[PDB]
Amino acid sequence: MSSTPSNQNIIPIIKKESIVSLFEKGIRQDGRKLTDYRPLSITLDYAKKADGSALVKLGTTMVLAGTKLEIDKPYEDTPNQGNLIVNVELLPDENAIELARVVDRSLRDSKALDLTKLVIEPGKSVWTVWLDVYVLDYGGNVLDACTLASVAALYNTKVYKVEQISVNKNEVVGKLPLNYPVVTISVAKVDKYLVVDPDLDEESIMDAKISFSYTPDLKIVGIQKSGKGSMSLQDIDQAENTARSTAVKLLEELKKHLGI
Amino acid sequence: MSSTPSNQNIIPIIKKESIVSLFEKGIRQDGRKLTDYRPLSITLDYAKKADGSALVKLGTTMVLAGTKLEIDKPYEDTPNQGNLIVNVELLPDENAIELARVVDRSLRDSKALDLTKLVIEPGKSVWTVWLDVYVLDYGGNVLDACTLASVAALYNTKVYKVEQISVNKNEVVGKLPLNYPVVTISVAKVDKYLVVDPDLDEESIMDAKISFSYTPDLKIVGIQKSGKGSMSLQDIDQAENTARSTAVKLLEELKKHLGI
Amino acid sequence: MSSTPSNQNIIPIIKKESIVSLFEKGIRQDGRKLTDYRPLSITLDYAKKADGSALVKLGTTMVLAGTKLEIDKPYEDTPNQGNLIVNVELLPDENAIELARVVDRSLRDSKALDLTKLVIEPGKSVWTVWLDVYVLDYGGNVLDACTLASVAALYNTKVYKVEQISVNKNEVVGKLPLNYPVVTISVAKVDKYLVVDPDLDEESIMDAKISFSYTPDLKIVGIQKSGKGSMSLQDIDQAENTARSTAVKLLEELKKHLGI
Amino acid sequence: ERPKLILDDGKRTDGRKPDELRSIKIELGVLKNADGSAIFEMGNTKAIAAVYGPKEMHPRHLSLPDRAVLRVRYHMTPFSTDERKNPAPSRREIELSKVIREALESAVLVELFPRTAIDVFTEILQADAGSRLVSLMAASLALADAGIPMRDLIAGVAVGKADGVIILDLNETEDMWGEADMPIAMMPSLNQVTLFQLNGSMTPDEFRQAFDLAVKGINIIYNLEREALKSKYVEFKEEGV
Amino acid sequence: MREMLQVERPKLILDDGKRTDGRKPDELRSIKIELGVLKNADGSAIFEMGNTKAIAAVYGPKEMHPRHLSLPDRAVLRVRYHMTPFSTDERKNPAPSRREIELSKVIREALESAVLVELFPRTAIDVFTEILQADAGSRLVSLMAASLALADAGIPMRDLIAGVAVGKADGVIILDLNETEDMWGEADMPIAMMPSLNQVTLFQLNGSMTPDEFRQAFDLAVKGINIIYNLEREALKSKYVEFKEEGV
Amino acid sequence: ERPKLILDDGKRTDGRKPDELRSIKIELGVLKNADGSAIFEMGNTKAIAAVYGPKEMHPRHLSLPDRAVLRVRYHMTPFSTDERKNPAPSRREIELSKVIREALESAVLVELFPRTAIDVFTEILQADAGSRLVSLMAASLALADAGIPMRDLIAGVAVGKADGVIILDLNETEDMWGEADMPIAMMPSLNQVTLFQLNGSMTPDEFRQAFDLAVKGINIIYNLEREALKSKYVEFKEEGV
Ligand SMILES: Nc1ncnc2c1ncn2[C@@H]1O[C@H](COP(=O)(O)OP(=O)(O)O)[C@@H](O)[C@H]1O
Ligand SMILES: Nc1ncnc2c1ncn2[C@@H]1O[C@H](COP(=O)(O)OP(=O)(O)O)[C@@H](O)[C@H]1O
Known part of the structure; x- marks a missing residue:
């Protein structure tokens, strides 16, 4: 049973009017233009006992994602596929579950990770990729940071030698079958303006936000409208143009962090 | 841990006296005699993806029950039996669980459904009958409506061809091994009167109600006293006479809906 | 998520001074010296359907513990061991879970029960000892009573004939592979005094309590500091001297109840 | 293979006639920290009951304006039966x-x-x-x-x-x-x-x-x-009704 | 003989412009709407799109159970999406799925x-x-x-x-x-x-x-x-609407 | 089977003497949206802690009249160990x-x-x-x-x-x-x-x-x-007690 959150720290009409007056001049509180992403940090191999991990700082938002690989029997329905299990946890559920699914969907539908290559003995044994994403600092636009931390954690993942039946965890065979990275870009609709990567303040004054997932060849690979309000037709159209021309820049930057 | 419901939907002493004053003249709010059942509608095969379903309208109470058949290994304790799993859900638990068990018990102990004919290969594979009952409109006397919807859903159930390995769901082999229908009749004790099939109002002013389950040759197959109050000895005696002479009426009507 | 309990009962500053003024004269409310245990009753095989049970009365605290034996496949990790599963219940959780673990740990680490002796067929089938401990009367120092009830319940346990496939529960083969009993002694720090086996009142005025587990050979086998306050270095030192010289007396008495 | 339950003359599996109770044992006030307590035995069925007497209700929105709220828990200890009952509450316990x-x-x-x-x-x-x-x-x-x-x-x-x-x-x-x-x-x-x-x-x-x-x-x-209420302790050997 | 391998997935667009259920790419399924179908609810409706049938009940603005969870300025919506175990070909577990959440x-x-x-x-x-x-x-x-x-x-x-x-x-x-x-x-x-x-x-x-x-x-x-x-809008007027599937 | 723990020289498995600490790393105020935060690392054990400062309690009946109520959560990330620990809280975590x-x-x-x-x-x-x-x-x-x-x-x-x-x-x-x-x-x-x-x-x-x-x-x-409080960041190489 899903209900309107009684927490959600209301933000006065006067403060909203201050932020909107800045938007009218195409500048924000942080200083960035309406279309700018926040400063992006990625530290790879942060959690040492993970098979692969990534700590992402997008503005004040911090996500740590880590992968853990295991060998299981493939699930009777999908006999020639490995498994990917995404899991999000907020620390400061329902939003968590929604976050997990949105990320999962965009990693799986893009085929950024090829599950059919995670097979060891078809029908007998396959790899299961456990992806676990931990939001440590809720600085707004958690979704975009999650997609980044996820993708990064997968690109950092080390696969081990298989005794065929048993894992030898100190011989590294290779990396995950990853076709390409994926980015998610969230565009917030505050009043009558579209704003890329909304911060904590902007998310609490916005009508709704819409999130676009892209592959490097700029195919839309997932869309999620989110928020208590509505958005016009022309808005979603414009949002996606903005979202996409942002994706190019974010992808280049993500790649620099991930090494090529 | 079971506690007195705090949504005890209280009904004023003045309104109670109005209804009791009518009972004293052998008539009720809705016009029926102290011993009359409410108007009864049954629509068979309402949920199309069910193996068999029935939507029952008893007064303002609405129950939808549906069966779904599966092939399972019989449980180690009962090797030459199929399975029946009844499940009730209120929509507007504890009362749900009690409803499920009361229905289950009266379908099983009457042997209205013969579980020993649901065997395919003894010890190897049997049919499991999933009965799911959904109360959509709580109009009082939910139990009697549940029994009806259940029985009807079972009589509407289609069994499929067993390909020798699994199920071929577009060839219909036959029906369920059903010996006879079963009816449950609830008699409420309001004040010093006994009232058959109490409605929403009558249930909230009653001391307690007692429910009798009957097979067509009028064998008592289940009794359940229910309600926060008590009932006298000759009350239970009288109640059952009333319940039973009602049962005959209700059974013939159920059968008409069920096509003999 | 563990939080400070809101509904345990505060005890006035005036009543606290009264008890402390008595400690200052080396006497307590009930009459015993600062180092005395409360009166101890043990009734063996109290729960008749258990495979061994014990009802312990330590002061007003009452614990009933009962064992139930079963045959399972041993854990893939521990192929040459039987299982011990301790479970605590409070009736008048978190404190329960903590109690279960503290008892488990001291029964296991002491080797008081030898799990490697509970093997029937190595890798194929072993005994699982279900120990269930029920606190019926919370009279303070529940931990010490639990250890006693547990140990006593294990010493009362009857093992049955193993008949291949199953168990034949009316032929008694022998008793559990028990090396020795174990006692847990709790020492409370009230004000500036150390008090052995605190009662209900003493536990609610204490700073913190510390519990020491001993084998008959006076080896420390478990320590658990407990309570919302702190204890000094010399306190823990002194506590354990007191705890140990108490253990000798309590072990004697426990053995008398058990039939050495 | 089922058992004969009433053998050719009158006697049941436990040697009772069809109109005989099992042995009864009742004792009262057996728990010191409860407001009221009792142990009841019928033959081999023992139960213990504790009552924690009329008190303010924890979250006040769940209390009733005119009534006390009864909170009742039926539970079976894992060692009450032949096969170990799971302590987690069963639909039947509910x-x-x-x-x-x-x-x-x-x-x-x-x-x-x-x-x-x-x-x-x-x-x-x-x-x-x-x-x-x-x-x-x-x-x-x-x-x-x-x-x-x-x-x-x-x-x-x-x-x-x-x-x-x-x-x-x-x-x-x-x-x-x-x-x-x-x-x-x-x-x-x-x-x-x-x-x-x-x-x-x-x-x-x-x-x-x-x-x-x-x-x-x-x-x-x-x-x-009624006797157990005055004397706190009652025993009763099996007898004909 | 890669030569005979042919995609497992079925064609979804077939002869003429048309689809698996015989619809053109620009045609809705049949629609059926009925209002006030539940007596004891504050508002109710059954909606069918082709073979997808949902029932919705509303229990109208009421004071909130535990008052700390209510909102000072707003009503709190409480929404439950749920699939009956017999809504699908195989049986959906009644316990809520992450997808339902x-x-x-x-x-x-x-x-x-x-x-x-x-x-x-x-x-x-x-x-x-x-x-x-x-x-x-x-x-x-x-x-x-x-x-x-x-x-x-x-x-x-x-x-x-x-x-x-x-x-x-x-x-x-x-x-x-x-x-x-x-x-x-x-x-x-x-x-x-x-x-x-x-x-x-x-x-x-x-x-x-x-x-x-x-x-x-x-x-x-x-x-x-x-x-x-x-x-x-029609169904709001007349309480009951039935529309045979057709071209946009 | 079973490993050695102190070696023929008198050193442990990780090359430490019996009286040496692991390396220590402490950094404070690492989380922006918390009222207080810290990362502590003893050798290979890294923990992060966030505090959300004294605040009016959600359901008031659970608050205390005289005291603050501490709410503490110990949790292990699934990827903190060698074999993936389940995220669902374990009795040990409790x-x-x-x-x-x-x-x-x-x-x-x-x-x-x-x-x-x-x-x-x-x-x-x-x-x-x-x-x-x-x-x-x-x-x-x-x-x-x-x-x-x-x-x-x-x-x-x-x-x-x-x-x-x-x-x-x-x-x-x-x-x-x-x-x-x-x-x-x-x-x-x-x-x-x-x-x-x-x-x-x-x-x-x-x-x-x-x-x-x-x-x-x-x-x-x-x-x-005491150090890390004054400078917000502290590194300490392993050494003898
Ligand atoms: N899960 C179980 N496993 C084994 N024996 C049981 C179980 N549940 C009940 N029993 C025993 O069989 C009897 C059947 O219980 P039932 O007739 O449903 O209710 P009651 O407990 O009032 O007798 C119980 O009294 C108990 O002695
Ligand atoms: N547990 C399930 N078992 C069988 N079919 C399912 C199950 N869950 C979903 N489906 C099927 O998938 C269809 C489409 O699901 P989805 O893509 O979520 O869209 P929608 O929820 O709008 O139907 C459902 O309508 C249903 O037929």
Whole structure:
């Protein structure tokens, strides 16, 4: 049973009017233009006992994602596929579950990770990729940071030698079958303006936000409208143009962090 | 841990006296005699993806029950039996669980459904009958409506061809091994009167109600006293006479809906 | 998520001074010296359907513990061991879970029960000892009573004939592979005094309590500091001297109840 | 392979005639930290009940403006049965709790303690059938021990049919293989039926016979409850109704 | 003999312009709407799109149970998306799935943009929704059934909510999907609108699309929504509406 | 089968003498949206702690009239260990939370904030033993960072016995195969033991040695905490007690 959150720290009409007056001049509180992403940090191999991990700082938002690989029997329905299990946890559920699914969907539908290559003995044994994403600092636009931390954690993942039946965890065979990275870009609709990567303040004054997932060849690979309000037709159209021309820049930057 | 419901939907002493004053003249709010059942509608095969379903309208109470058949290994304790799993859900638990068990018990102990004919290969594979009952409109006397919807859903159930390995769901082999229908009749004790099939109002002013389950040759197959109050000895005696002479009426009507 | 309990009962500053003024004269409310245990009753095989049970009365605290034996496949990790599963219940959780673990740990680490002796067929089938401990009367120092009830319940346990496939529960083969009993002694720090086996009142005025587990050979086998306050270095030192010289007396008495 | 339940002349599996109760043992105020407590035994069915007397209710929105809220818990210890019952509550324990609570609600004068909660905890230490009734009576007595006002005490037996014969107060075995099992609980002085169930199969005429026998048994038990209230401890060897 | 291997996945666009259920790419499934079907609810509706049937009950503005969870200025919407175990071909476990949990949040947020909650402070409006038959688009059939059940409960809203799932099947953009099209199509994009305000209430895409396709799929969805909306307004007047499937 | 723990030279599995700490790293105020935060790393055990400062309590009936209510969560990330620990809370996590809370309750002056709740969340990012202490210290520091008044800082080490030898600050390997494992946490300036546990086996005379050693280790760690408070960031290479 899903209900309107009684927490959600209301933000006065006067403060909203201050932020909107800045938007009218195409500048924000942080200083960035309406279309700018926040400063992006990625530290790879942060959690040492993970098979692969990534700590992402997008503005004040911090996500740590880590992968853990295991060998299981493939699930009777999908006999020639490995498994990917995404899991999000907020620390400061329902939003968590929604976050997990949105990320999962965009990693799986893009085929950024090829599950059919995670097979060891078809029908007998396959790899299961456990992806676990931990939001440590809720600085707004958690979704975009999650997609980044996820993708990064997968690109950092080390696969081990298989005794065929048993894992030898100190011989590294290779990396995950990853076709390409994926980015998610969230565009917030505050009043009558579209704003890329909304911060904590902007998310609490916005009508709704819409999130676009892209592959490097700029195919839309997932869309999620989110928020208590509505958005016009022309808005979603414009949002996606903005979202996409942002994706190019974010992808280049993500790649620099991930090494090529 | 079971506690007195705090949504005890209280009904004023003045309104109670109005209804009791009518009972004293052998008539009720809705016009029926102290011993009359409410108007009864049954629509068979309402949920199309069910193996068999029935939507029952008893007064303002609405129950939808549906069966779904599966092939399972019989449980180690009962090797030459199929399975029946009844499940009730209120929509507007504890009362749900009690409803499920009361229905289950009266379908099983009457042997209205013969579980020993649901065997395919003894010890190897049997049919499991999933009965799911959904109360959509709580109009009082939910139990009697549940029994009806259940029985009807079972009589509407289609069994499929067993390909020798699994199920071929577009060839219909036959029906369920059903010996006879079963009816449950609830008699409420309001004040010093006994009232058959109490409605929403009558249930909230009653001391307690007692429910009798009957097979067509009028064998008592289940009794359940229910309600926060008590009932006298000759009350239970009288109640059952009333319940039973009602049962005959209700059974013939159920059968008409069920096509003999 | 563990939080400070809101509904345990505060005890006035005036009543606290009264008890402390008595400690200052080396006497307590009930009459015993600062180092005395409360009166101890043990009734063996109290729960008749258990495979061994014990009802312990330590002061007003009452614990009933009962064992139930079963045959399972041993854990893939521990192929040459039987299982011990301790479970605590409070009736008048978190404190329960903590109690279960503290008892488990001291029964296991002491080797008081030898799990490697509970093997029937190595890798194929072993005994699982279900120990269930029920606190019926919370009279303070529940931990010490639990250890006693547990140990006593294990010493009362009857093992049955193993008949291949199953168990034949009316032929008694022998008793559990028990090396020795174990006692847990709790020492409370009230004000500036150390008090052995605190009662209900003493536990609610204490700073913190510390519990020491001993084998008959006076080896420390478990320590658990407990309570919302702190204890000094010399306190823990002194506590354990007191705890140990108490253990000798309590072990004697426990053995008398058990039939050495 | 089923067992013969009534052998050729009169005697059941435990050597009782069809109209004999099991042995009864009652003791009151056995728990020192409860407001009222009682242990009830019927043959091999032991139950212990504790009451924690009228008190303010924790989250006030769940309390009632005019009534006390009864909170009743029926529970079976893992070692109460032959095969270890799982401690996690079963659908059957959930139903039995609701049945027992509704039973007690008709006896306890809750309209005397508004905005309060009365907590009745019950554990079955040995289960040998009739455990829902042994529980209910232990509760009733524990309430009386807690000095909480009631219309009457609650007394109850399970009556059943075996090899076509109507029998009083059932075995583990009679519950298991008998054609019917009908627990009945009364407020005997008011002739009020507090709890009433039947699982199994009966003709209307045998239902009325079973009914009559149950009353007689209840009356005998009731007398012991009354004795147990004054003297705190009662034993009763198996006897004919 | 790679030579004989031929894709496992079935063709979704077949002879003539047409699809697996005999519909053209620009045709809705049959629609059936009925209002006030539940007596004891404050507002109720049954919505069918082809083989997807949802029932929605509303229990109207009421004081909230534990007062600390209520809102000082707004009503709290409580929304439940649920599938009956017999709604699907195989049996859906009744215990709530992560997918049901997500769909509930998305449906609630959708309704929150339509319902004028700023009118009923310290109250809760309860919207329960069962899916009785699932054949794709069930999150939208549910949302619309809810929107109508709200209107039936006489609760003030900015507009009614109308929605279709638009998708891409065999490189072709199609309107209102089958379970089969949902299964095997490249893309599945549910869109819900407040048509008179041109406000997008719900918007999702699972699958893959080029920016232009996305924009085409977008224009087709609007047209479908507009036809459905008309039936909603009709169904509000007459309580009962039946529409044979056909071209946008 | 079974490993060696102290070698023929007298060094342990990780090349430490029996009286050497692991390397220590502390950094404060690392989380922007928390009222106080800290990362603590003992060798390979890294914990992060966030504090959400004194705040009006959600359901008021659960608040205390005179005190703040501490809310403490000990949790291990699935990727903190070698074999993926389930995210669903384990009985061990539940106990550790209670132990850590009771530890903090003795240090934090809760008297000062009635009707409020102080949240302390703790995640273990890498587990290599002593994780209940690394968590507790990270928490203690995060509280000090949140500017919440306390009697003293909390410092702690696990002391144990490997092969008959008493050792300071254990590996997963020493925890795994050692005869004893004794976590001790203190308010060093007051000589107050805040947390104290022992799993395994010890003679009374041994217990008293392991104790003295623990104190010496605690004193060195305490100095770094005091340090890390003043400069926000502290590195310490392994060395002898
Ligand atoms: N899960 C179980 N496993 C084994 N024996 C049981 C179980 N549940 C009940 N029993 C025994 O069989 C009897 C059947 O219980 P039932 O007739 O349903 O209610 P009651 O507990 O009132 O007799 C019980 O009294 C108990 O002695
Ligand atoms: N547990 C399930 N068992 C069988 N079919 C399912 C199950 N869950 C979903 N489906 C099928 O998938 C269809 C489409 O689901 P989805 O893509 O979520 O869209 P919608 O929820 O709009 O139907 C459902 O309508 C249903 O037929």
